Amino acid sequence: KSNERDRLKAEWDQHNDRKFVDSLVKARIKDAMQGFIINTEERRNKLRE
């Protein structure tokens, strides 16, 4: 009972500690690629002109 709650609490926070880091990295990488999307969009506008 007590060790039963403790074990899954431990596993809970253990994969929390890494899902934290790589989710934040994924969000920042999405921001970087949408910045590059803005770059190629103005690039296309120049090509159209």
């Binding site: 190629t40 690039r43 296309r44 120049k46 090509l47 159209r48």
Partner: protein, 373 residues
Amino acid sequence: SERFVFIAEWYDPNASLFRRYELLFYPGDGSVEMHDVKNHRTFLKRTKYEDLHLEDLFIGNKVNVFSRQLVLIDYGDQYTARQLGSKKEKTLALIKPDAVSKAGEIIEIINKAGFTLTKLKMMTLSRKEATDFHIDHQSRPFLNELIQFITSGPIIAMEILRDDAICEWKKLLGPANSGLARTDAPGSIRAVFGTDGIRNAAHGPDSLSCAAREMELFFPSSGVCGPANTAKFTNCTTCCIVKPHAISEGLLGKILMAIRDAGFEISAMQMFNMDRVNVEEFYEVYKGVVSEYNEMVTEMYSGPCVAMEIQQTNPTMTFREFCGPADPEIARHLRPGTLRAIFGKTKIQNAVHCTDLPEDGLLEVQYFFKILD
């Protein structure tokens, strides 16, 4: 009667399994038949088709019929295996560090005999690779001369095929000694474009056993050898593409002719086999811009093509003016002197693709000469 059978795959844009089919070309009158291997039924009954030619039928070649694009993987049956089997021979031809100026003539004289062209590199050979290349004459008093010539200028490596292509390319080579070729005068590549028997124009394997090790040394299977002699950052740089069309009918040496006679400095060549997702990145700035982006995509990946870097010279006229407009029929009347004016037809099947926007220049150069081997 007298039918030709091949086995092919097609990647369907829906469900991702490779559809396995059976292609059948009739040379008596140009007709296509396809059978299905998975379920033994019919597929596209025997119908006339005046866009498929005999030279397109080759192993590993990339053939388009009814927008259902095929790639060939087997020789059908033993009959056409005999007909186009021991015929085809793979050979590695080498432009020397000399006659790189007249590279187009040599590409053209391979193109004359029907020697179909599959891989193309322009590399400055490394120090370590030279002694691998010099196995044919190892430990004889010619290593210093042959090293000093070979590891001096950029060489151009060549994969070639036709029947008994070994001895047919030796027949283009003529005598091995270029001085002997001049004294004999048989109309060989050294007899027209040589200097001497250590710097002639071209020499490679003498048999298939040596052709195997030449192939492995110069075109590796995972790839490390050619240092990709491009000089990517050279400011006045432009990347253009001799299209899979112009490669298929065979215009590469003549394009090299037309561009070097204007003083523009060719700095890098490579043939790369286009795939769809990779064509999207080189033509990334075109979707939405041109209302027929899809035909440009399928013309790019409808076959092998050579990327090349051109260095800007010949003042006033830039490469955009040397190639002129986009459509060859725009260019035929308006500015009637461009390479896109008269070296190519239609609009789908143009000769070259330029960098269009200026800044957008080192990008292409990098794509096909840095971020893609």
